[PDB]
Amino acid sequence: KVFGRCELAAAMKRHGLDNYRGYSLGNWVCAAKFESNFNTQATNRNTDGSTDYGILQINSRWWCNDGRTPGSRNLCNIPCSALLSSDITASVNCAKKIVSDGNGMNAWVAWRNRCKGTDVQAWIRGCRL
Ligand SMILES: C[C@@H](O)CN1CCN(CC(=O)O)CCN(CC(=O)O)CCN(CC(=O)O)CC1
Ligand SMILES: C[C@@H](O)CN1CCN(CC(=O)O)CCN(CC(=O)O)CCN(CC(=O)O)CC1
Ligand SMILES: [Cl-]
Ligand SMILES: [Cl-]
Ligand SMILES: [Cl-]
Ligand SMILES: [Cl-]
Ligand SMILES: [Cl-]
Ligand SMILES: [Cl-]
Ligand SMILES: [Gd]
Ligand code: NA
């Protein structure tokens, strides 16, 4: 599923991601745009052989099982395919664990380089939320 901006904002808010760990909703929407272009089915292979999955490009090295990242962990206790569903619940629940792990949203490279320090409220501007 390719979400619209306000559609994704509403879903993230409903699932409690807004202000989670102090990160306002626009941070999460901005991260999703640059990680996945709002596409739940996005997948991208990393240099080390892990893969990133879903709207927030969550990494099989630590967070989900894809059966092809030998030696990796599955700290969200999910198949990585659960992160590709039209329903973002699993991605949100796993993102909450990631952003709580000490590094905050710096875990998302596209967020650090393209969202951090910007006017992120622009990403939710105009939406009814
Ligand atoms: C903040 C960094 O630590 C992030 N971290 C980098 C790698 N870590 C480094 C280390 O923990 O020294 C080694 C693996 N780490 C072991 C563990 O955490 O117990 C599991 C994955 N972690 C889970 C987490 O950290 O909550 C996510 C990635
Ligand atoms: C192997 C190293 O990770 C040892 N570690 C070095 C420092 N870590 C590094 C990191 O976790 O990235 C940061 C603090 N760490 C956060 C956490 O672990 O959740 C708490 C203490 N840790 C608990 C543990 O790791 O079992 C012991 C010391
Ligand atoms: Cl929309
Ligand atoms: Cl915001
Ligand atoms: Cl694996
Ligand atoms: Cl594990
Ligand atoms: Cl933080
Ligand atoms: Cl990570
Ligand atoms: Gd860690
Ligand atoms: Na894994």
Side-chain angles (χ1 to χ4, degrees), residues 5-53:
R5 180 174 61 89
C6 294
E7 185 188 17
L8 183 60
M12 286 177 157
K13 177 172 195 178
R14 175 163 57 83
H15 288 296
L17 192 63
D18 61 312
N19 309 318
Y20 190 87
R21 280 260 54 83
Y23 289 94
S24 66
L25 187 55
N27 279 286
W28 295 104
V29 176
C30 184
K33 184 67 172 191
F34 295 132
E35 290 292 351
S36 68
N37 207 14
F38 300 154
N39 179 13
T40 68
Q41 296 192 260
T43 61
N44 294 284
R45 194 76 184 264
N46 301 133
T47 309
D48 66 1
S50 67
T51 302
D52 292 347
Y53 295 86

Short mmCIF file of all heavy atoms in Angstrom, two decimals, residues 5-53:
data_model
loop_
_atom_site.label_atom_id
_atom_site.label_comp_id
_atom_site.label_asym_id
_atom_site.label_seq_id
_atom_site.Cartn_x
_atom_site.Cartn_y
_atom_site.Cartn_z
N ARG A 5 -0.01 11.16 2.51
CA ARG A 5 0.63 11.80 3.65
C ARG A 5 -0.29 11.87 4.87
O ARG A 5 0.03 11.39 5.97
CB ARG A 5 1.04 13.18 3.19
CG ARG A 5 1.73 13.96 4.23
CD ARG A 5 2.25 15.27 3.66
NE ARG A 5 1.19 16.13 3.14
CZ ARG A 5 0.52 17.03 3.85
NH1 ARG A 5 0.78 17.22 5.13
NH2 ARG A 5 -0.43 17.74 3.27
N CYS A 6 -1.45 12.51 4.71
CA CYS A 6 -2.35 12.67 5.84
C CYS A 6 -2.92 11.33 6.30
O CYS A 6 -3.17 11.14 7.49
CB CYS A 6 -3.49 13.64 5.52
SG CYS A 6 -2.93 15.33 5.27
N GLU A 7 -3.13 10.41 5.35
CA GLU A 7 -3.57 9.07 5.69
C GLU A 7 -2.55 8.40 6.60
O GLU A 7 -2.91 7.80 7.62
CB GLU A 7 -3.76 8.28 4.39
CG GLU A 7 -4.34 6.92 4.57
CD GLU A 7 -4.34 6.08 3.29
OE1 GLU A 7 -3.62 6.43 2.34
OE2 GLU A 7 -5.09 5.07 3.26
N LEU A 8 -1.26 8.50 6.25
CA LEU A 8 -0.25 7.88 7.09
C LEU A 8 -0.16 8.58 8.44
O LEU A 8 -0.01 7.93 9.49
CB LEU A 8 1.12 7.91 6.38
CG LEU A 8 2.20 7.21 7.19
CD1 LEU A 8 1.88 5.75 7.44
CD2 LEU A 8 3.53 7.38 6.44
N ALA A 9 -0.22 9.91 8.44
CA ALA A 9 -0.18 10.65 9.70
C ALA A 9 -1.28 10.18 10.64
O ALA A 9 -1.04 9.97 11.84
CB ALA A 9 -0.31 12.14 9.43
N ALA A 10 -2.49 10.02 10.11
CA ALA A 10 -3.62 9.60 10.94
C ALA A 10 -3.39 8.20 11.48
O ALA A 10 -3.71 7.93 12.64
CB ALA A 10 -4.91 9.68 10.13
N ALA A 11 -2.87 7.30 10.65
CA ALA A 11 -2.64 5.94 11.10
C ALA A 11 -1.56 5.91 12.17
O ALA A 11 -1.68 5.20 13.17
CB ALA A 11 -2.26 5.05 9.93
N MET A 12 -0.48 6.66 11.95
CA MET A 12 0.59 6.70 12.95
C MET A 12 0.09 7.27 14.27
O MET A 12 0.43 6.76 15.34
CB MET A 12 1.75 7.53 12.40
CG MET A 12 2.55 6.82 11.32
SD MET A 12 3.83 7.93 10.71
CE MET A 12 5.00 6.74 10.06
N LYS A 13 -0.72 8.34 14.20
CA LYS A 13 -1.26 8.93 15.41
C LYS A 13 -2.16 7.94 16.13
O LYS A 13 -2.07 7.76 17.36
CB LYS A 13 -2.02 10.21 15.06
CG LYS A 13 -2.66 10.84 16.27
CD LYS A 13 -3.23 12.20 15.95
CE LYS A 13 -3.53 12.93 17.20
NZ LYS A 13 -4.04 14.28 16.91
N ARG A 14 -3.04 7.29 15.39
CA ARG A 14 -3.94 6.33 16.00
C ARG A 14 -3.17 5.24 16.74
O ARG A 14 -3.59 4.81 17.83
CB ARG A 14 -4.83 5.72 14.94
CG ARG A 14 -5.72 4.63 15.45
CD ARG A 14 -6.84 4.36 14.45
NE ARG A 14 -6.33 4.03 13.13
CZ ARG A 14 -5.93 2.82 12.76
NH1 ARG A 14 -5.99 1.79 13.58
NH2 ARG A 14 -5.43 2.66 11.53
N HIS A 15 -2.04 4.80 16.18
CA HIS A 15 -1.19 3.77 16.78
C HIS A 15 -0.21 4.31 17.80
O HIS A 15 0.65 3.56 18.26
CB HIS A 15 -0.44 3.00 15.69
CG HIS A 15 -1.32 2.09 14.89
ND1 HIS A 15 -1.97 1.01 15.44
CD2 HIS A 15 -1.69 2.13 13.59
CE1 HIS A 15 -2.67 0.40 14.50
NE2 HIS A 15 -2.51 1.06 13.37
N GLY A 16 -0.35 5.57 18.21
CA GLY A 16 0.42 6.09 19.32
C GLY A 16 1.85 6.47 19.01
O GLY A 16 2.66 6.55 19.93
N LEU A 17 2.18 6.60 17.74
CA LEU A 17 3.54 6.94 17.39
C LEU A 17 3.79 8.43 17.53
O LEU A 17 4.95 8.83 17.72
CB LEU A 17 3.81 6.44 15.97
CG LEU A 17 5.28 6.47 15.55
CD1 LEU A 17 6.14 5.55 16.40
CD2 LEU A 17 5.37 6.07 14.09
N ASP A 18 2.76 9.26 17.43
CA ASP A 18 2.96 10.68 17.58
C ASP A 18 3.44 11.02 19.00
O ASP A 18 2.84 10.60 19.99
CB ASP A 18 1.68 11.46 17.25
CG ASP A 18 0.49 11.12 18.14
OD1 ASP A 18 0.18 9.93 18.36
OD2 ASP A 18 -0.20 12.07 18.58
N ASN A 19 4.53 11.81 19.09
CA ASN A 19 5.18 12.21 20.33
C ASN A 19 5.82 11.05 21.06
O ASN A 19 6.29 11.22 22.20
CB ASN A 19 4.21 12.95 21.28
CG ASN A 19 3.50 14.08 20.58
OD1 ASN A 19 4.13 14.81 19.81
ND2 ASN A 19 2.20 14.23 20.84
N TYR A 20 5.90 9.88 20.43
CA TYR A 20 6.50 8.74 21.08
C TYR A 20 8.00 8.99 21.23
O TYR A 20 8.67 9.41 20.29
CB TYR A 20 6.23 7.48 20.25
CG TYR A 20 6.63 6.23 20.99
CD1 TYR A 20 5.75 5.62 21.86
CD2 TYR A 20 7.91 5.71 20.87
CE1 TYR A 20 6.12 4.50 22.57
CE2 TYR A 20 8.28 4.60 21.58
CZ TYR A 20 7.40 4.00 22.43
OH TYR A 20 7.81 2.88 23.10
N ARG A 21 8.50 8.79 22.46
CA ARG A 21 9.88 9.09 22.78
C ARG A 21 10.23 10.54 22.47
O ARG A 21 11.39 10.87 22.24
CB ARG A 21 10.86 8.09 22.13
CG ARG A 21 10.94 6.78 22.91
CD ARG A 21 12.18 6.74 23.79
NE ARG A 21 12.28 7.90 24.68
CZ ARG A 21 11.66 8.00 25.84
NH1 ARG A 21 10.88 7.03 26.30
NH2 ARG A 21 11.81 9.10 26.57
N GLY A 22 9.23 11.42 22.49
CA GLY A 22 9.42 12.82 22.26
C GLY A 22 9.49 13.25 20.82
O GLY A 22 9.77 14.42 20.55
N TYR A 23 9.23 12.35 19.87
CA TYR A 23 9.31 12.67 18.45
C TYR A 23 7.91 12.97 17.92
O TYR A 23 7.07 12.08 17.85
CB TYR A 23 9.96 11.52 17.68
CG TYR A 23 11.43 11.41 17.98
CD1 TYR A 23 11.88 10.56 18.97
CD2 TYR A 23 12.36 12.17 17.28
CE1 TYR A 23 13.22 10.45 19.26
CE2 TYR A 23 13.71 12.07 17.55
CZ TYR A 23 14.13 11.20 18.54
OH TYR A 23 15.49 11.09 18.75
N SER A 24 7.71 14.21 17.52
CA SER A 24 6.42 14.65 17.02
C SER A 24 6.06 13.90 15.74
O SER A 24 6.91 13.37 15.02
CB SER A 24 6.46 16.14 16.75
OG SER A 24 7.35 16.39 15.68
N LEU A 25 4.77 13.92 15.44
CA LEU A 25 4.24 13.17 14.30
C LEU A 25 4.95 13.52 13.00
O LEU A 25 5.20 12.63 12.18
CB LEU A 25 2.74 13.42 14.22
CG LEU A 25 1.97 12.60 13.18
CD1 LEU A 25 2.18 11.11 13.35
CD2 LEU A 25 0.49 12.95 13.30
N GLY A 26 5.25 14.80 12.76
CA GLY A 26 5.91 15.16 11.52
C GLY A 26 7.25 14.49 11.33
O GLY A 26 7.66 14.23 10.20
N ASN A 27 7.98 14.25 12.43
CA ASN A 27 9.23 13.52 12.32
C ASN A 27 9.02 12.13 11.71
O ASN A 27 9.81 11.68 10.88
CB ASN A 27 9.89 13.35 13.69
CG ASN A 27 10.64 14.60 14.11
OD1 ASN A 27 11.70 14.87 13.58
ND2 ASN A 27 10.07 15.38 15.02
N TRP A 28 7.98 11.44 12.17
CA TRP A 28 7.69 10.09 11.71
C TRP A 28 7.22 10.08 10.26
O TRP A 28 7.57 9.19 9.49
CB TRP A 28 6.65 9.44 12.62
CG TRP A 28 7.16 9.24 14.01
CD1 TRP A 28 6.85 9.97 15.11
CD2 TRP A 28 8.10 8.25 14.43
NE1 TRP A 28 7.53 9.50 16.20
CE2 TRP A 28 8.31 8.44 15.82
CE3 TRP A 28 8.79 7.23 13.78
CZ2 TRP A 28 9.17 7.63 16.55
CZ3 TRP A 28 9.64 6.43 14.50
CH2 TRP A 28 9.82 6.62 15.88
N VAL A 29 6.37 11.04 9.89
CA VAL A 29 5.90 11.13 8.52
C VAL A 29 7.06 11.44 7.58
O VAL A 29 7.21 10.82 6.52
CB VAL A 29 4.75 12.15 8.42
CG1 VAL A 29 4.32 12.31 6.97
CG2 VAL A 29 3.58 11.69 9.28
N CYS A 30 7.90 12.41 7.95
CA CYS A 30 9.08 12.73 7.15
C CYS A 30 9.98 11.51 7.00
O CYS A 30 10.46 11.21 5.90
CB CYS A 30 9.81 13.89 7.84
SG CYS A 30 11.25 14.51 6.94
N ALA A 31 10.22 10.80 8.11
CA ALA A 31 11.06 9.62 8.03
C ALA A 31 10.48 8.62 7.04
O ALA A 31 11.20 8.05 6.23
CB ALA A 31 11.24 8.98 9.40
N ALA A 32 9.18 8.36 7.15
CA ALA A 32 8.57 7.39 6.25
C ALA A 32 8.65 7.84 4.80
O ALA A 32 8.86 7.01 3.90
CB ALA A 32 7.11 7.14 6.65
N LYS A 33 8.48 9.13 4.53
CA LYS A 33 8.55 9.55 3.15
C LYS A 33 9.92 9.23 2.57
O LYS A 33 10.01 8.71 1.45
CB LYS A 33 8.26 11.02 2.97
CG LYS A 33 8.26 11.42 1.47
CD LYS A 33 7.10 10.80 0.69
CE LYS A 33 7.00 11.37 -0.72
NZ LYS A 33 5.74 10.98 -1.40
N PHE A 34 10.99 9.57 3.29
CA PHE A 34 12.31 9.40 2.72
C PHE A 34 12.83 7.98 2.85
O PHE A 34 13.67 7.57 2.06
CB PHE A 34 13.28 10.44 3.28
CG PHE A 34 12.92 11.82 2.88
CD1 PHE A 34 12.89 12.81 3.84
CD2 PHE A 34 12.67 12.16 1.54
CE1 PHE A 34 12.64 14.11 3.49
CE2 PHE A 34 12.37 13.47 1.20
CZ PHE A 34 12.36 14.44 2.17
N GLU A 35 12.32 7.21 3.80
CA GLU A 35 12.72 5.80 3.89
C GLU A 35 12.04 4.95 2.82
O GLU A 35 12.69 4.07 2.25
CB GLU A 35 12.40 5.25 5.28
CG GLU A 35 13.29 5.81 6.37
CD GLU A 35 14.75 5.37 6.27
OE1 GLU A 35 15.04 4.47 5.42
OE2 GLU A 35 15.59 5.93 7.02
N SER A 36 10.75 5.17 2.59
CA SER A 36 9.97 4.24 1.79
C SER A 36 9.09 4.88 0.74
O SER A 36 8.37 4.17 0.04
CB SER A 36 9.05 3.41 2.67
OG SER A 36 8.05 4.25 3.23
N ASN A 37 9.05 6.21 0.68
CA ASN A 37 8.08 6.96 -0.12
C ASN A 37 6.65 6.53 0.21
O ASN A 37 5.76 6.50 -0.64
CB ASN A 37 8.38 6.96 -1.62
CG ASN A 37 7.84 8.21 -2.33
OD1 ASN A 37 7.46 9.20 -1.70
ND2 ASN A 37 7.77 8.14 -3.66
N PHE A 38 6.42 6.27 1.50
CA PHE A 38 5.11 5.93 2.04
C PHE A 38 4.60 4.56 1.55
O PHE A 38 3.40 4.27 1.67
CB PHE A 38 4.05 6.99 1.76
CG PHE A 38 4.32 8.36 2.31
CD1 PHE A 38 3.75 9.43 1.68
CD2 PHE A 38 5.00 8.59 3.50
CE1 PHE A 38 3.86 10.71 2.20
CE2 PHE A 38 5.12 9.88 4.01
CZ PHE A 38 4.54 10.93 3.35
N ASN A 39 5.49 3.72 1.04
CA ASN A 39 5.12 2.44 0.45
C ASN A 39 5.41 1.31 1.44
O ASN A 39 6.57 1.04 1.75
CB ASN A 39 5.93 2.25 -0.82
CG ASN A 39 5.63 0.93 -1.50
OD1 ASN A 39 4.66 0.25 -1.17
ND2 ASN A 39 6.47 0.58 -2.44
N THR A 40 4.35 0.65 1.91
CA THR A 40 4.55 -0.45 2.86
C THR A 40 5.35 -1.59 2.26
O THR A 40 5.95 -2.35 3.02
CB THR A 40 3.23 -1.02 3.41
OG1 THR A 40 2.53 -1.69 2.37
CG2 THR A 40 2.34 0.07 4.01
N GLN A 41 5.37 -1.74 0.94
CA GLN A 41 6.04 -2.88 0.33
C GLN A 41 7.51 -2.63 0.04
O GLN A 41 8.15 -3.53 -0.50
CB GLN A 41 5.32 -3.33 -0.94
CG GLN A 41 3.92 -3.82 -0.65
CD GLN A 41 3.35 -4.53 -1.86
OE1 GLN A 41 2.56 -3.93 -2.62
NE2 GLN A 41 3.72 -5.74 -2.05
N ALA A 42 8.05 -1.48 0.39
CA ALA A 42 9.44 -1.16 0.09
C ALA A 42 10.39 -2.14 0.77
O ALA A 42 10.28 -2.41 1.96
CB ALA A 42 9.75 0.24 0.58
N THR A 43 11.38 -2.62 0.02
CA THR A 43 12.46 -3.45 0.54
C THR A 43 13.77 -2.99 -0.09
O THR A 43 13.80 -2.66 -1.27
CB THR A 43 12.28 -4.95 0.23
OG1 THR A 43 12.26 -5.18 -1.19
CG2 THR A 43 11.03 -5.50 0.86
N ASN A 44 14.84 -2.98 0.70
CA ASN A 44 16.14 -2.60 0.16
C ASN A 44 17.22 -3.38 0.87
O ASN A 44 17.30 -3.43 2.09
CB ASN A 44 16.37 -1.11 0.32
CG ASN A 44 15.42 -0.31 -0.51
OD1 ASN A 44 15.59 -0.23 -1.72
ND2 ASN A 44 14.40 0.27 0.13
N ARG A 45 18.13 -3.93 0.07
CA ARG A 45 19.20 -4.77 0.56
C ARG A 45 20.38 -3.92 0.99
O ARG A 45 20.84 -3.05 0.24
CB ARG A 45 19.68 -5.70 -0.55
CG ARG A 45 20.56 -6.85 -0.04
CD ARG A 45 19.63 -7.87 0.62
NE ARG A 45 20.28 -9.01 1.24
CZ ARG A 45 20.45 -10.18 0.66
NH1 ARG A 45 20.12 -10.38 -0.60
NH2 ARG A 45 20.91 -11.20 1.38
N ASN A 46 20.91 -4.24 2.15
CA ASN A 46 22.06 -3.54 2.71
C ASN A 46 23.34 -4.27 2.31
O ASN A 46 23.33 -5.45 1.97
CB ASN A 46 21.95 -3.51 4.23
CG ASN A 46 20.69 -2.84 4.72
OD1 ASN A 46 19.99 -3.36 5.61
ND2 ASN A 46 20.37 -1.71 4.13
N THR A 47 24.46 -3.54 2.41
CA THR A 47 25.78 -4.07 2.04
C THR A 47 26.10 -5.36 2.77
O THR A 47 26.76 -6.26 2.22
CB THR A 47 26.87 -3.04 2.35
OG1 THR A 47 26.51 -1.77 1.80
CG2 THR A 47 28.21 -3.48 1.79
N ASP A 48 25.70 -5.46 4.04
CA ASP A 48 26.06 -6.62 4.86
C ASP A 48 25.17 -7.82 4.61
O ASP A 48 25.34 -8.86 5.27
CB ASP A 48 26.08 -6.27 6.35
CG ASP A 48 24.73 -5.89 6.92
OD1 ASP A 48 23.73 -5.91 6.18
OD2 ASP A 48 24.67 -5.59 8.13
N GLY A 49 24.21 -7.72 3.70
CA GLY A 49 23.33 -8.82 3.40
C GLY A 49 22.01 -8.81 4.15
O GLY A 49 21.12 -9.61 3.82
N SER A 50 21.87 -7.94 5.14
CA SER A 50 20.56 -7.69 5.73
C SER A 50 19.70 -6.92 4.74
O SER A 50 20.17 -6.46 3.69
CB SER A 50 20.71 -6.92 7.04
OG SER A 50 21.20 -5.60 6.82
N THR A 51 18.41 -6.79 5.08
CA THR A 51 17.45 -6.08 4.26
C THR A 51 16.59 -5.21 5.16
O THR A 51 16.30 -5.58 6.30
CB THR A 51 16.56 -7.09 3.49
OG1 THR A 51 17.39 -7.93 2.70
CG2 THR A 51 15.55 -6.44 2.56
N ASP A 52 16.19 -4.06 4.63
CA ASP A 52 15.27 -3.15 5.28
C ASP A 52 13.88 -3.30 4.68
O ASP A 52 13.72 -3.40 3.47
CB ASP A 52 15.73 -1.71 5.08
CG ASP A 52 16.99 -1.38 5.80
OD1 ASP A 52 17.48 -2.10 6.66
OD2 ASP A 52 17.48 -0.26 5.52
N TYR A 53 12.87 -3.26 5.55
CA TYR A 53 11.50 -3.62 5.19
C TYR A 53 10.50 -2.55 5.61
O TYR A 53 10.48 -2.13 6.77
CB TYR A 53 11.08 -4.93 5.85
CG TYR A 53 11.86 -6.12 5.38
CD1 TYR A 53 13.08 -6.45 5.97
CD2 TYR A 53 11.40 -6.91 4.34
CE1 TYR A 53 13.81 -7.55 5.52
CE2 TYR A 53 12.12 -8.00 3.88
CZ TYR A 53 13.33 -8.31 4.47
OH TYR A 53 14.03 -9.39 3.99
#
